[PDB]
Design a protein around this ligand. Structure first.
Ligand code: HEM
Ligand code: HEM
Ligand code: HEM
Ligand code: HEM
Lengths: 142, 141, 141, 142
């Protein structure tokens, strides 16, 4: 996961404009709605029974924020991603088994949510930089 | 597999795309070629740079294949018959790559239709693209 | 797209399994639970140790679902309708997990049918198991 | 990739009984046969047009051996697997520039061919030790 400076620029230039308080919840919500089997990994998380139900379930929105944090943490330490998400997957015991594909799906959902919030600004090369990131972070959680 | 309300959501979403059909297919391809660079091996005889005339035409071919699936959503295998055959036998496309184009297509719509890309609509578009990919890869199965 | 020849290879391979139906289903489960331990979260209320009455019983249940699909291979969706609902809606099974069992099922056949597990028969059993897995996941698409 | 000692016993014991000269060729042919798209990465290898053909093709059989060779060397270099399949991916330029999934398909096919040759000796515990290995390898090459 070596990002070139242009890749680094693209990711961080956009990630400062991010409504941190909400985009995590948008991303985690849309995952539980678009890929329903992911609800199994929560549903001990309130009512997860509709788009609307999920989009405004408080523990969704709250854990969205952690997800976004987790991500910025990957940003600041690309070259050592397994060592940043070390105590992360560890402090979860056995809540982060799932299969690495659903980390990749979460990361693609986030990409969809960024593009949704930035439109034209989320250009194809900006996407490519983020895909590199989501990729390395996914594979870290493993 | 596709509910009446997926069918409504997908036809709605294509509605707003309107004539930006080919364009948005072009851009989805470019997102795929830049984000998932293995995919470029299938297009060697293509110049894949920004504004390629070739990525626009193909991008318009892909956009009309999909509009055709939408138009014939209840009989996609017959509709997409000849493209199933193209993609699995002639071109031998790796099935994983359909997931990647699908994602770049969902990302392109997200970027071009902020109001229409509700969670519900995103789910339906994901399901529609998964059914199309299932068709395109069915002559492996 | 199960051809006439995949259908022949699958009915063959199956027939040789004979009554070792459930046994081979049990072993496939056990292979799955040791190789892919994430999968064990779906069976918390099971004892998953060797010789489990519960893995034998469910292994027989999975082998008969499969036999049913074989036996109704041209109308698998209707045949597996209720199981599509169970796994997708009720149990919310991650789709990846069907690739893992399918593989533990082909490993188990390999190990018990050294004569029947030719390249050709392997490819047809894989296509068969991918088709079943598609149905069982078709209430996600 | 931590193999336990009994996982290690399982793998190595079986692995010495293995007829190297061709189990590799058996596993690479079944790959081109079971998952046809993978022929695109060869077909320079000659005719890949029927089961019978792929199984017979000489370059299939030859690269079968190389493939088995890569495996024994991953066996002898688990904890820094990446630090072993380095020369491997590098000396190929962009020949292993394909989705990680296909490295995992090759692994599973091999597992099938090992079970095929060892029947009862390829118990579920022996299989599981080998799944750990193919996984670390695949994740190395990519
Ligand atoms: C999938 C990506 C996930 C990420 C990135 C993530 C992130 C985090 C972070 C950063 C923390 C520490 C911060 C803090 O404690 O305030 C934490 C703790 C925690 N995590 Fe997660 N988590 C994920 C999935 C899950 C799942 C699936 C569960 C349970 C079903 C879960 C349950 C918890 C709990 C209970 C805590 C500590 C207490 C709490 O705040 O609820 N997480 N997680
Ligand atoms: C939604 C999924 C897809 C659709 C609707 C689609 C559609 C099409 C169409 C309509 C054509 C015919 C174009 C023509 O005759 O000029 C075509 C050809 C082709 N498709 Fe796709 N395709 C899809 C997925 C893919 C993927 C994932 C790949 C590769 C990664 C791919 C690679 C190709 C190639 C290489 C050609 C031939 C290029 C040429 O020589 O002009 N397709 N596809
Ligand atoms: C070839 C693919 C599969 C077939 C044919 C199949 C078949 C079945 C059948 C027939 C039942 C009903 C059993 C009964 O009535 O007692 C069932 C239930 C169940 N299936 Fe599957 N299944 C498949 C794949 C999977 C996978 C991959 C998982 C999860 C990893 C899974 C998890 C379950 C669970 C947890 C139950 C309920 C267990 C219980 O409470 O008894 N199945 N399946
Ligand atoms: C995917 C797993 C692959 C593995 C494990 C593998 C293994 C190897 C190894 C170990 C060598 C060096 C031989 C030695 O020093 O003993 C080699 C060389 C080579 N590889 Fe691969 N390879 C793979 C895929 C491919 C592909 C897809 C191609 C495409 C044509 C390819 C073409 C070649 C060629 C032409 C050589 C040099 C000539 C030869 O020794 O055959 N390989 N490979």
């Amino acid at each position: 996961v070596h990002l070139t400076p242009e890749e680094k620029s693209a990711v961080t230039a956009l990630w400062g404009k991010v409504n941190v308080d909400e985009v995590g919840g948008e991303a985690l919500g849309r995952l539980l709605v678009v890929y329903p089997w992911t609800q199994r990994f929560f549903e001990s998380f309130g009512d997860l029974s509709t788009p609307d139900a999920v989009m405004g379930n408080p523990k969704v929105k709250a854990h969205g924020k952690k997800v976004l944090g987790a991500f910025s943490d990957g940003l600041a330490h690309l070259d050592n991603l397994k060592g940043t998400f070390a105590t992360l997957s560890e402090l979860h015991c056995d809540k982060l088994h799932v299969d690495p594909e659903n980390f990749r799906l979460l990361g693609n959902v986030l990409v969809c949510v960024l593009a949704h919030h930035f439109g034209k600004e989320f250009t194809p090369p900006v996407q490519a930089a983020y895909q590199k990131v989501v990729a390395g972070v996914a594979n870290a959680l493993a | 597999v596709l509910s009446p309300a997926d069918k409504t959501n997908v036809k709605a979403a294509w509605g707003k795309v309107g004539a930006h059909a080919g364009e948005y297919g072009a851009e989805a391809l470019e997102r795929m070629f830049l984000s998932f660079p293995t995919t470029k091996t299938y297009f060697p005889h293509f110049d894949l740079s920004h504004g390629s005339a070739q990525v626009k035409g193909h991008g318009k071919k892909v956009a009309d294949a999909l509009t055709n699936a939408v138009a014939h959503v209840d009989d996609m295998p017959n509709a997409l018959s000849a493209l199933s055959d193209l993609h699995a036998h002639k071109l031998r496309v790796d099935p994983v790559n359909f997931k990647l184009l699908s994602h770049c297509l969902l990302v392109t719509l997200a970027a071009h239709l902020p109001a229409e890309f509700t969670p519900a609509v995103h789910a339906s578009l994901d399901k529609f693209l998964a059914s199309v990919s299932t068709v395109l890869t069915s002559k492996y199965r």
